[PDB]
Design a protein around this ligand. Structure first.
Ligand SMILES: O=C(O)c1cc(-c2ccccc2O)nc2c(Cl)cccc12
Ligand SMILES: [Zn+2]
Length: 351
């Protein structure tokens, strides 16, 4: 359990010490938000969280930022696309707020992004603060990727906010009743959800997003309400997730020449981690003294997901993130052997 401590402490100090990167991001974002609010289609745009500009998915990249701009859409009509459980058409039920994007009753996403990019394109050129350059690599969202200075990069995703109850494909998901209680699940399922532009594999579809729910679970994660509040008796749930995230980043980086790990992301490791939290609901099953063993249960469960080619979306049980149509067995067999090598040789990619 010793070397995992040193890894988590190197990540702690780089995450902690001073950097002007977050300040430059907030300046650019606020300039965009006031510019977008001056427009008819994006007058109600805004951050998901105020103060949360420096959201870091890549846990080893201090200069990579991930922000989400939300947009409230009253009376959303969701039409599931091709039984995909996660991809939806967006239609409308008496105003014309976003009506300048309708094609029929169906809301166009690629057109809303084009107007989203041009307005951001206008505010970027009108910047005298810092060197900011825009990139338009495909994939519906992240819609825009900005670059500030020679290190700071920001991915900006436009998201629609719905406040109706979650789509039916989520009814049997979020199985936290024996871990976080059934009453917390009812509270969380009363919160809004978000839709980002995404293709399953052309059409104008959107994907469900519950990252805000995941963030709230991570900050209130124990079966006991006082979990990790006695800072001398902290569980190792968050440390296991960091170690799982850092393992995949180091493997994706070590094999970026080959293409076998491009389909994998921290969301897969994050999803598998939540499933283990359901399997092991007791805080005693996450004792800080059992860091090595608890981290091994995560590596073990994730390895079984690769072999069986089964990883359920934590909110949508019927969506298999490891479907052979999403990731072929060659890629999953490749990742299975690389982790097994790291596990047996005491994770060399950690020092
Ligand atoms: O925002 C989220 O909650 C979120 C959802 C999904 C997802 C949802 C349904 C089906 C497949 C998916 O991959 N994937 C993500 C990835 Cl890959 C990266 C970051 C966030 C997400
Ligand atoms: Zn805890």
């Amino acid at each position: 359990a010793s070397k995992l401590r040193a890894v988590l402490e190197k990540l702690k100090l780089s995450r902690d010490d001073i950097s002007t990167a977050a300040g430059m991001v907030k300046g650019v974002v606020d300039h965009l938000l006031l510019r977008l609010k001056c427009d008819s289609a994006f007058r109600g745009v805004g951050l998901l969280n105020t103060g949360s500009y420096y959201e870091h998915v890549k846990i080893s990249a201090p200069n990579e930022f991930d922000v989400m701009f939300k947009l409230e859409v009253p009376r959303i009509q969701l039409e599931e696309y091709s039984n995909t459980r996660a991809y939806y058409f967006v239609k409308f039920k008496k105003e014309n707020p976003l009506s300048q994007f309708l094609e029929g009753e169906i809301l166009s996403a690629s057109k809303m992004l084009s107007k989203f990019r041009k307005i951001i394109k206008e505010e970027i050129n009108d910047i005298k603060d810092t060197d900011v350059i825009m990139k338009r690599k495909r994939g519906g969202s992240p819609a825009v990727t900005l670059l500030i200075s020679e290190k700071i990069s920001v991915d900006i995703t436009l998201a629609l906010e719905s406040k109706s109850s979650w789509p039916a494909s989520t009814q049997e998901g979020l199985r936290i009743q024996n871990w976080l209680s059934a009453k917390v699940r009812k509270q969380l399922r009363l919160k809004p959800f978000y839709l980002v532009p995404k293709h399953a594999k052309q059409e104008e579809t959107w994907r469900l997003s519950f990252s805000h729910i995941e963030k709230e679970i991570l900050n209130n994660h124990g079966k006991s309400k006082t979990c990790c509040e006695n800072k001398e008796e902290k569980c190792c749930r968050k440390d296991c997730l960091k170690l799982m995230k850092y393992l995949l980043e180091q493997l994706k980086e070590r094999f970026k020449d080959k293409k076998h790990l491009d389909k994998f992301s921290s969301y897969h490791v994050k999803t598998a981690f939540f499933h283990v939290c359901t399997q092991n609901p007791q805080d005693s099953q996450w004792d800080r003294k059992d860091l090595g063993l608890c981290f091994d249960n995560c590596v073990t469960y994730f390895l079984q997901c690769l072999r069986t080619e089964k990883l359920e979306n934590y909110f949508i049980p019927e969506f298999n993130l490891f479907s052979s149509n999403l990731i072929d067995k060659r890629s999953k067999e490749f990742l299975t052997k690389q982790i097994e090598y790291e596990r047996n040789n005491e994770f060399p990619v950690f020092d």
